[PDB]
Amino acid sequence: QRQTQTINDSWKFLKGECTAAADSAFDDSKWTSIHLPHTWNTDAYTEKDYYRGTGWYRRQLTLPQGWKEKQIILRLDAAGKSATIYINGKNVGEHAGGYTACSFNITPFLSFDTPNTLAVCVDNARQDIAPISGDFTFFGGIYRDVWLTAVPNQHFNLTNHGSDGLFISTPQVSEEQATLSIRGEVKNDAPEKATLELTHTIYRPDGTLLQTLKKNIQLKAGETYAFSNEATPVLKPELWTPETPRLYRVETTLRNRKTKTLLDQSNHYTAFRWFRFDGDEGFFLNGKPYKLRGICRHQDQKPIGPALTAEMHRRDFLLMKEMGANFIRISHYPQADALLEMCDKLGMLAWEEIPIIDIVPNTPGYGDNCERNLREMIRQHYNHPSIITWGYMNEILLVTQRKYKTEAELKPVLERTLALANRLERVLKEEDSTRISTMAFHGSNSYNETGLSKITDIVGWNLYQGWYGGDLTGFEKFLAQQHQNHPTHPMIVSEYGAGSDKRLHSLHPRAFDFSIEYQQKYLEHYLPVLEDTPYICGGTHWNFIDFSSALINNKGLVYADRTPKDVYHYYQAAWRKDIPVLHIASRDWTDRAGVQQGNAPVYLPVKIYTNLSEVELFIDGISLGKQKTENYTATFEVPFSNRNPFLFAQGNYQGKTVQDGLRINFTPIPACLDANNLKGLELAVNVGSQCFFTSDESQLTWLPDQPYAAGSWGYIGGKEGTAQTEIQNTADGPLFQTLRNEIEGYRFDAPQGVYEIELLFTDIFRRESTFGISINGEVVEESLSPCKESGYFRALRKKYYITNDKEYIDIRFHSTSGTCFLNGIKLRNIY
Amino acid sequence: QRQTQTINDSWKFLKGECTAAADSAFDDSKWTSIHLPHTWNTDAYTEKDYYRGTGWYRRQLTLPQGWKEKQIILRLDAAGKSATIYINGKNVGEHAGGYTACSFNITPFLSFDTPNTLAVCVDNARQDIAPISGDFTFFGGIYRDVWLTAVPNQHFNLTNHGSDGLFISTPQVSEEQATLSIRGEVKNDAPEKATLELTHTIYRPDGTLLQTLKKNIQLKAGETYAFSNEATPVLKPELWTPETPRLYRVETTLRNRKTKTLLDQSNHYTAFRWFRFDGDEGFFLNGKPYKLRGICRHQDQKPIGPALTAEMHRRDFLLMKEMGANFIRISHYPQADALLEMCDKLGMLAWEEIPIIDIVPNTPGYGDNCERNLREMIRQHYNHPSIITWGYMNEILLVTQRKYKTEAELKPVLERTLALANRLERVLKEEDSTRISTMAFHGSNSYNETGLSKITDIVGWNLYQGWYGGDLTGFEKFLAQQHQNHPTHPMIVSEYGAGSDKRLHSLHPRAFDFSIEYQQKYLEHYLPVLEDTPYICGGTHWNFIDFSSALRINNKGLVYADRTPKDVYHYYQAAWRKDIPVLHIASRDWTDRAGVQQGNAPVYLPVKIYTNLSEVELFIDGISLGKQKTENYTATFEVPFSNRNPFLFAQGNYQGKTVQDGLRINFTPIPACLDANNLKGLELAVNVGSQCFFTSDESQLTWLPDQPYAAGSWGYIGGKEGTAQTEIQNTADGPLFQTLRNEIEGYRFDAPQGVYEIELLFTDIFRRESTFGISINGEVVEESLSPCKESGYFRALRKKYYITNDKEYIDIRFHSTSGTCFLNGIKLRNIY
Ligand code: NA
Ligand code: NA
């Protein structure tokens, strides 16, 4: 019978090409001891010292005696970008693509006397294998399990594109009666004939047997046999939705028939479900209408050790289901098997796609390798009922439109692109005609004007109105105009979202400030549009989780360490009717600070996400009133005063009482500096920005810029300036990324003493900008030119010890070349 | 007038030896662009590729025109471990000491018409500059600010051991009156003669002027003038304590006697306080009993970028001060100045020490460089009122007694050591008779036999009874013993604590499981002994914050490295604050709960409460669990966990007001008796051989503590518990693999028929090599598995098998061949 285990242990690994490291006689003593899954560049210095090259994986296989008359199948669940397999120095085969599995019958190349050498030649630098752009162009390693399967010589075909060789489909489904079709290949690898018996046992969702199918066959030696057995129509079927995921086990045993011995066995689930996308009326599931409540999802495990990302795939999914999503868009996800299994068993419709993104260049064999990835994805995941559609292209004109302008420049690229698109579109339905095809566009109409939208069953629009330029209400406007022009093209919003930093907070949120509060606004707008519009089949939000790459990736709902952002609970409130949701949406904001008048309490908004009709918010036991909820949200102006306040909210749902609680930190900052309130104070201002930044260098909260008023402090002159480049030499990137430009001076009305002043600059204007600085009429810097000394986009921090013998600190800026700017200022009383 | 700024920007750097890197013409185009501070080696392996040697720092100096007449003093607040500085290829000077400052008058080497090149050679592999052992042996870089100061040609001495040049101290302090002595050195770097006015103004804590002192002085060219000005005795002085930190500012101004023009100006705080240490009655502060509630502290900041570690020193202090601490014990702290400024102003007593530790080597120059460092430390901090005692050694016998075991190879090292101890004790009292001296020992009576404890004014014991062996009561017993044999040695417990890991929790915590709960058991035993024992002056806990080192147990702190307090932080806060209400549900350390559940009966797990309220009431999801009266500032509730997202809520009455705390956590129930339905989406994982829950950082699974097999359930068969303390290769989930069931016979789950994924976890930890097979219901999956031969000792193996169960149970059997069978963890989950 059949036996499957992992060989993930006791590997040696050498980063670099090497002189037949496939040889069994090799000295791998000084290579690195590694344990698979193994991910290559888990240390990011950008392009410089990010490894693009060939690596070598080596492990000894000492075989078990119980396998000497058994075929041995070696499978690699995923290995990117491409690997070649050496048993004992000999080439068994290669693979191209780091998101599908591959498998090789390695029985010939193996002896049972001396230990065998398994060597793998992996390469992440291959521009002829998708993806060719984006964060995963160089995703390298054997970053998934590796399996040794042993079977009798009469087995199912485990070398059909890395799949199970089995394919269960349902050719007709209705509420009353559905048909089943079980297909696959059997392979005789013994040197003679064989008379066998093929059984199909079909179980109900409750465990009991429903139907048995026996059929029996003969096979000349070496023969591979193609079976295809219909089944008795299932009467009154148990139908499958993400809310009701009823699965029928299909056990497929293979018996010797002279002796009724069991040989090989292979279980698979299937389920009964039908669906259609209507261009006017939306999605339908089992006859009944249904909103796709989706999120996108690709490889995004956090690096937790040397060459080792996390393995949280499963508990990640629990977090999607408890948010109440019913749809997942999958791409760049190695061993997506693991994810779809839970999409089947726990409930979540799915699309998956091979990753052909951004541009179709003239790279030889790109097209050929892409069609193979498309076939592999479909065959390896055929038997998942959660999968209702296969894609293959994502924003395929995005880089083309940046790189080619004249229609004489685009004609050879568009020809090439429509060509690969149609090619893969036929491969798709040649491989599986029981699912819908889709293609995701970026927000331009040239996916219509070039023909790419007439190819696929349905179409995805990646819309970022209100993020990458534009206004929030152009989201509905873009979709409306798309449904007016092309009403037969049923639409999904396959990507939307806005990035956010836990470090950033605003009371006046605008796009590209990266504040928690703006992503909350942007998603508070989009989510009703997706639900209350009928001709929108639903959406898939930008990748569920935040992630980083050396080569903007913070638009998710869950932080990289798997804590949900506050806004997670906004979806949960809107998508889970079954349980009460009550979230004080201030986990993202436990380090609060504001400017205070004398002893007048400070008011900062505290938001609440709930699905309760009304909710009460208390602080230190003092009811702040009741508030009716609209769009699952409610905002209180909370009077922060005391330093360790305690927020508490409650309300009612379905008879019972629902509560939440949370402790935060609040620090007040004086509006008018006298000498009591200056002591132990570090007054830090995020010049030229409207955001509270909370520092990782210092854990100080750098306050928003405010204009100088008599008795107080603030800026004099200038206008807000923003840049979006990586600022080097600091962890506090965002503080340097916003300045006040054409600044005249900065002033604090502060008593006499000795003060430490820090000033923060970064030149972001690639005549050069040079200026002088003075304090209380005495020159501390005669000519400061941030770009000649640091360079553009590096960071400067200058600290000055100042002896103030006036009643104010008047810092002022002296234009010489270009413009005066200030990126941050910090004041500190010393004496 | 005095102008002082940083030259931290615009540096190029090169990791390794280079020649002509000092010269101004040199090409540093292809060098690394950096901003100071700059810490070396923010990357973790040990002796391999953690850098040891020379490194070069380059910057261009554009001297302003209005500075042409002035003197230029260059101050490096700290460089580790050694720095040599070049101005335009010319060697200005040298420093030896990773923790003190250095200063140089660079006026003669600078050009005012061209640009200058500032060039610094840093060497961290210096086996003659303390510390020569421990986590800071190779701490390297210019990891503190670098400054340019420009003064007129008559100024205060900026080049006396890299200090301010001024020295203020109170010769007599009492309730009735005190005296104030202001000393310093005025420097004339002109070629002429100068006639000057020197003024000291003394301000009251409230800011008003108490007094002015003028004195005319005359200096030849190139002269250093040592002044020493008494002040009018201060009547009814405002006394300083950590709870009342009144400071008198002293402004020292240098004027030209003719034109009354301001030349230099140096502000300092002084303060009036006195103290003693008694062998019987402990510590006294302004004549009252005072118990030292202390914490240790050294360089602490987490890496936050390439070569860049945080500068959270001032926020790290508010944490110490809000816990209620009144004492801090400082060492391996570069530019401690910033810390002691908080001590002075916000209120906390300090002791400081240069880092001589572990062994005194036979190293030419070491003793000399230590003396030079002790002086630097005292002169740079002489004016900090909060400093009450200086120290220089710390377990100076620890490594000596390990490496050497015969009294012949011991005799030279013990001579070398008392020799250096006396030298430094002489130097200390020479530099500062205003402050008591101290030494920190490890827990061995050898410091009394050798006579090391007859040297300093007080002694400190670094005691870990209950952690490194013994049991918690050996603590008070050790001190009880010490006080009785040397009663004239006043005692501070100068270090204590116990390591902990947020990932681990136990209901029966024993030393070295690293469970959060043992650390609380340990600190709940120690703190009362510290308060209630008279002859103990106080304690200083282990380093306030967890920290990782890249060399060769670094988690005994009260605060995690992300600067979040552990839960036991509030045990200290409740015992040490009386001003504010403290009421903390001790469960931030434990928000991923899980446990074994009978049917649907609720799973009882403990929830501890730290507070200084007299009685607390705990609710879960709104259901009161009833009030509890609090003792030793703690209350435990046995809580019934049901729902998967409970809401804990406590309340009580402090000072007639109401006090509340609340917290949402997570609970996963795991079924004791499996069936075809509770396996649906289950992942049953067992920390085999441990009695501890382990929440994983790979998966987020909470691996349940081992239970033995009982019919209808699951569990182990056979074998003893076994534990290890080496770290483990190839996994983030270390503690999982550090405990196993040794000589295990098997593991059995009673589960239905079906297809199951079984994952087994091994690490051989026993230097024939063990080998065994593994059968699951009679099928042989591993035929000859040997973790040590295949992988290695202390490497992880994760084997994973797909198996088809036709019995009503999964009976895993271990079949020995050589050595013993063992299992560090097992995880099952149903596929079909
Ligand atoms: Na800014
Ligand atoms: Na274990």
Side-chain angles (χ1 to χ4, degrees), chain A residues 685-689 721 734-740 760 822-824:
Chain A
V685 175
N686 179 14
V687 176
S689 150
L735 193 65
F736 290 87
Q737 273 176 353
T738 38
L739 37 62
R740 178 152 306 267
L760 272 41
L822 186 59
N823 310 45

Side-chain angles (χ1 to χ4, degrees), chain A residues 1 3-6 9-10 33 35 65 145 311 314 341 659 697 797-799 830-831, chain B residues 4 6 9 35 145 267 311 345 664 683 698 779-780 782-783 790-791 795 798 800 802 829:
Chain A
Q1 45 186 48
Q3 188 162 37
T4 295
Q5 78 179 55
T6 66
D9 46 314
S10 324
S33 275
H35 200 277
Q65 260 49 254
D145 302 296
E311 317 125 25
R314 187 154 309 109
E341 150 151 7
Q659 323 178 300
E697 295 197 49
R797 308 170 67 96
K798 309 222 82 295
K799 268 187 262 158
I830 298 203
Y831 289 101
Chain B
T4 299
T6 63
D9 51 286
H35 196 324
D145 287 311
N267 289 253
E311 307 158 57
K345 236 177 285 180
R664 267 263 172 69
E683 202 147 8
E698 280 185 4
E779 202 187 88
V780 161
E782 268 320 326
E783 165 172 311
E790 262 214 311
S791 278
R795 267 188 64 192
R798 292 184 95 105
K800 191 199 297 172
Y802 286 174
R829 65 161 252 270

Side-chain angles (χ1 to χ4, degrees), chain B residues 356-359 393-400 439-443 447 462 464 495:
Chain B
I356 304 170
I357 64 164
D358 276 9
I359 197 177
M393 284 179 155
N394 177 53
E395 308 172 338
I396 201 62
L397 295 188
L398 169 68
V399 149
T400 294
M439 200 171 278
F441 311 138
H442 84 240
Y447 299 89
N462 300 337
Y464 293 88
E495 210 179 42

